[PDB]
Design a protein around this ligand. Structure first.
Ligand SMILES: N#Cc1cc2c(Oc3ccc(F)cc3OCCn3ccc(=O)[nH]c3=O)cc(F)cn2c1
Ligand SMILES: [Mg+2]
Lengths: 544, 405
């Protein structure tokens, strides 16, 4: 007998103030009892479980389906472990290798021993025949299937065992997942099979079994909804359910599948369905489709018509991300190293706001792509953005907030992001000065908006169902309508001033949209602010 | 030996997510942590440790070698009563009054003191891997970790024992300690100050940032001095005075608003009257005086607001109660940042935090004029300080921007 190398256990404790699980045993049939006895006998023969005397250990429920042990009340009371893996590796980040071998370790958790001080908590009882004899007591000596701390301890043990072999084999690359290992190399294929055999021999020195010789899975691999090919990657086929009664759960599943498909399928739009998912009332709620949503799903099926595949990453080539505006606050992007060979794709939807402009959304999309790229490839890509250098310079130099975009260049693919209007920094000589004002009565909702100018031009308009802020916006809008191509505007509204200093080009409020459309037609606009009710000349609060 | 350290009553260790790092920073951290493991400063740990504190890498001034930095903010607030109440370090008010204050790094001495065995599990950190291809490396500290607020508290005794001779030799040299930073204030010439800093460094060697607070004062509120005033000039003046009236009560604007009476054009020159000139002069005199009753409460939080003025200009205010500023200042340094707003903002936040450390001995909470996403993406690429202040984000343009320019 060749002695197996020793592996050290992981000390496990319970949460503070919580005792072990002491749950009743649900009644089982006689066939289930016989099957459980047959299983546990061989399990004790293998050395994975031990028999405990009828003392006072903790009791965990067991059912038969192949057995099943339920540590549900133990998971609520077992301590917290470190996060095994938050995110899965993304195929676009993988580097091309001549050979890639998948090794799925069998009997993973049962090959690693359990903390001896914790085995007394992982004890269960098999009911005997007719409940005329005491039940059969068993406890676990290894990591149980379904225990909260089995994956973390297993992966730590696997890492500790794998470290020296990976260190002594620098000409191969090992990736460690939950219950699998992925070994890739650019060696001669015979040398690669030799190194795989050496790796599994190394794992067997510590007692870890893998598929012997071949019999291991060969490409294309089906892994985490992905299809991994030797020179490319894609996603597994997306199943789009079609019903004439679209329910809320259907739209949730469809949004999930479409977001999953958008990582390689360019042009996926999911806004019109999130608009139907805005309400979270009933999970079984038939919702009709808007014509915009119908055309959206039509073009989505048109995109999912012919298949597309992404390539693997090459560190020697540059990393490029190109952005396009799709409209309605939507952006799409492609990350590639060579033309027409995308590493991956994606989309970005604007945030929930009242006012916005294209430059801010483009900046946010750039930040998102930057974070994702640092996750996937560990570096920031060079950007190709539909915005001219001069536009970005004017924006970031005149913007009240700080802002920045990493290295990028202008790609001339419409629609281009542009600044639609720019307010002057100084009052305009020769331009008419419109002192505007608006005010509403809070009780009756009646108000007035208007202006007086230095040339004698005046206007007051009465309005029903309005507010102070709305009348101030309306006053500015009236001044914009009735003025020439150059105009100075004086207001006492901090609200309107803040809205216009946010520099929006699209708004939820149609009045702000009309103000923007008026500004767009202007040559020069200077917007000055003065304190209200301070006797400042042109500010005529008496006209309201 | 080691000093036993515990947590607050009823709080658990830090479980903060590690944020993504570039490949070069990951490699620098791998090398640094391998070297530190070879020297017992850190040790690997298994999955039984559920605690995690973020970590990244920086580059100091005039040095191309990377440095490891742990974002101990969460762990610092988990042990806030240790380093302040129980083992706090006093703050001398004579440091800001000194002419030249030099900042040095004394983190290498913290690694010589072993850490309490029961507390090491709370200093766990994770070097991450690209694309999650391998389980990230996890370490815990065995010695006093840099960036932790309890480290200077614990090392205070050894620091006093080391600095006693140099303190007794030159008593006019003020010494202060904050985190891994040692501030040394003196009234000497820059040459002899550098020689004394060399002497102090050689003194620290055998036992195991040139600032000038003398050139800083609280900036007053200045009103323009013109010979002819337009309508726009008087409107801006009245707005600024109405704003300042929230700080100084006796401000009056009625005689100046009396000039704007009518609907004149903005560019039209309006002559000042005797009443308006007298009102402007009285406002000037009121603004020349300090603010009435402005005190510093060591129990309240310090708040630092920053406004971007364009062309590399930045204004800032440190206060605890609104309109009761404890300090104001400007910043316009041309040191390689003409085309990057975020780098300028990061350097300005660093300068303001250092000034706050010198003046009050604790960092303020910032209100940055930047979106959360941009800042959180880019601020780590320009940071050069061992400490990290707290910050929030203002996403509505303040009207008061030009009232500080
Ligand atoms: N099932 C599954 C499975 C396999 C892998 C995976 O494999 C790799 C391991 C090491 C390496 F250096 C490269 C690797 O893959 C690069 C892409 N690739 C693929 C197939 C092929 O034939 N050639 C080729 O280059 C890496 C990972 F992160 C997750 N994985 C899941
Ligand atoms: Mg008004």
């Amino acid at each position: 007998m060749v002695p197996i190398s020793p592996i050290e256990t992981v000390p496990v404790k319970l949460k503070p103030g919580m005792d072990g699980p002491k749950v009743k045993q649900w009644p089982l049939t006689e066939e289930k009892i016989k099957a459980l006895v047959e299983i546990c006998t061989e399990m004790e023969k293998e050395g994975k479980i031990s028999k405990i005397g009828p003392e006072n250990p903790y009791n965990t429920p067991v059912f038969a389906i192949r057995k099943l042990v339920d540590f549900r009340e133990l998971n609520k009371r077992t301590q917290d472990f470190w996060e095994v893996q938050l995110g899965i590796p993304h195929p676009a980040g993988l580097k091309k290798k001549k050979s890639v071998t998948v090794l799925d370790v069998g009997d993973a958790y049962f090959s690693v021993p359990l903390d001896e001080d914790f085995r007394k908590y992982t004890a269960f009882t098999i009911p005997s025949i007719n409940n005329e004899t005491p039940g059969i007591r068993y406890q676990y000596n290894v990591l149980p299937q379904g225990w909260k701390g089995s994956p973390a301890i297993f992966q730590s043990s696997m890492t500790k065992i794998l470290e020296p072999f990976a260190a002594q084999n620098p000409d191969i690359v090992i990736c460690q997942y939950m219950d699998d290992l992925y070994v890739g190399s650019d060696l001669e294929i015979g040398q690669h099979r030799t190194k795989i055999e050496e790796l599994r021999q190394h794992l067997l020195r510590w007692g870890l079994t893998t598929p012997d010789k071949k019999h291991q899975k060969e490409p294309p691999f089906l892994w985490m909804g992905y299809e991994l090919h030797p020179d490319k990657w894609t996603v597994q086929p997306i199943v789009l359910p079609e019903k004439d009664s679209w329910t809320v759960n259907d739209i949730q599943k469809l949004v999930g599948k479409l977001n999953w498909a958008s990582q390689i399928y360019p042009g996926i739009k999911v806004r019109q369905l999130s608009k139907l998912l805005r309400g979270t009332k009933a999970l079984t709620e038939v919702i009709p489709l808007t014509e915009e949503a119908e055309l959206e799903l039509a073009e989505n099926r048109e995109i999912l018509k012919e298949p597309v595949h992404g390539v693997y990453y090459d560190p020697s080539k540059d990393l490029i991300a190109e952005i396009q505006k799709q409209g309605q606050g939507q952006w799409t992007y492609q990350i590639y190293q060579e033309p027409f060979k995308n590493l991956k794709t994606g989309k970005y939807a604007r945030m929930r706001g009242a006012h916005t402009n294209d430059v801010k959304q483009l900046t946010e999309a750039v930040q998102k792509i930057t974070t994702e790229s640092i996750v996937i490839w560990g570096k920031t890509p060079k950007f190709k953005l539909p915005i001219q250098k001069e536009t970005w310079e004017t924006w970031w130099t005149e913007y009240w907030q700080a802002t920045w975009i990493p290295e990028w260049e202008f790609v001339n693919t419409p629609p281009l992001v542009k600044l639609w209007y720019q307010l002057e920094k100084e009052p305009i000589v020769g331009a008419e000065t419109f002192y505007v004002d608006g005010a509403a009565n809070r009780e009756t909702k009646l108000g007035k908006a208007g202006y007086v100018t230095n040339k004698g031009r005046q206007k007051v308009v009465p309005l029903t169902n309005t507010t102070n802020q709305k009348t101030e916006l309306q006053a500015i809008y009236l001044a914009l309508q009735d003025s020439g191509l150059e105009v100075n505007i004086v207001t006492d509204s901090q609200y309107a001033l803040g809205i216009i200093q946010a520099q929006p080009d699209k708004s939820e409020s149609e009045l702000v949209n009309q103000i923007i459309e008026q500004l767009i037609k202007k040559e020069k606009v200077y917007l000055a602010w003065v304190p209200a009710h301070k006797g400042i000349g042109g500010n005529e609060q008496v006209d309201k | 030996e080691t000093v036993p350290v515990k947590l607050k009553p009823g709080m658990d260790g830090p479980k903060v997510k590690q944020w993504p790092l570039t490949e070069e920073k990951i490699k620098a951290l791998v090398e640094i942590c391998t070297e530190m493991e070879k020297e017992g400063k850190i040790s690997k740990i298994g999955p039984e440790n559920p605690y995690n504190t973020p970590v990244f890498a920086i580059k100091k001034k005039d040095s191309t070698k990377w440095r490891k930095l742990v974002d101990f903010r969460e762990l610092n607030k988990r042990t806030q009563d240790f380093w302040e109440v129980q083992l706090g370090i006093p703050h001398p008010a004579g440091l800001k009054k000194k002419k030249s204050v030099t900042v040095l790094d004394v983190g290498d001495a913290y690694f010589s003191v072993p850490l309490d065995e029961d507390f090491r599990k709370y200093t766990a950190f994770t070097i991450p891997s690209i694309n999650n291809e391998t389980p990230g490396i996890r370490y815990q500290y065995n010695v006093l970790p840099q960036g932790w607020k309890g480290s200077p508290a614990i090392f205070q005794s050894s620091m006093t024992k080391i600095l006693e001779p140099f303190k007794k030799q030159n008593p006019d040299i003020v010494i202060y300690q904050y985190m891994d930073d040692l501030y040394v204030g003196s009234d000497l010439e820059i040459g002899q100050h550098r020689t004394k800093i060399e002497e102090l460094r050689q003194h620290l060697l055998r036992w195991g940032y040139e600032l000038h607070p003398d050139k800083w004062t609280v900036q007053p509120i200045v009103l323009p001095e013109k010979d002819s005033w337009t309508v726009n000039d008087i409107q801006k003046l009245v707005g600024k005075l109405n704003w300042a009236s929230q700080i100084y009560p006796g401000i009056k604007v009625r005689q100046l608003s009396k000039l704007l009476r009518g609907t004149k054009a903005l560019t039209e020159v309006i002559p000042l009257t005797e009443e308006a000139e007298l009102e402007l002069a009285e406002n000037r005199e009121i603004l020349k005086e300090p603010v009435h009753g402005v005190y510093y409460d060591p129990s309240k939080d310090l708040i630092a607001e920053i406004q971007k003025q364009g062309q590399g200009q930045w204004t800032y205010q440190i206060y605890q109660e609104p309109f009761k500023n404890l300090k104001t200042g400007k910043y316009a340094r041309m040191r390689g940042a003409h085309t990057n707003d975020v780098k300028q903002l990061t350097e300005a936040v660093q300068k303001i935090t250092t000034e706050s450390i010198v003046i009050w001995g604790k960092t303020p909470k910032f209100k940055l004029p930047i979106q959360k996403e941009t800042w959180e993406t880019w601020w780590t690429e320009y940071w050069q300080a061992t400490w990290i202040p707290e910050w929030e984000f203002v996403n509505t343009p303040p009207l008061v921007k030009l009232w500080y320019q």
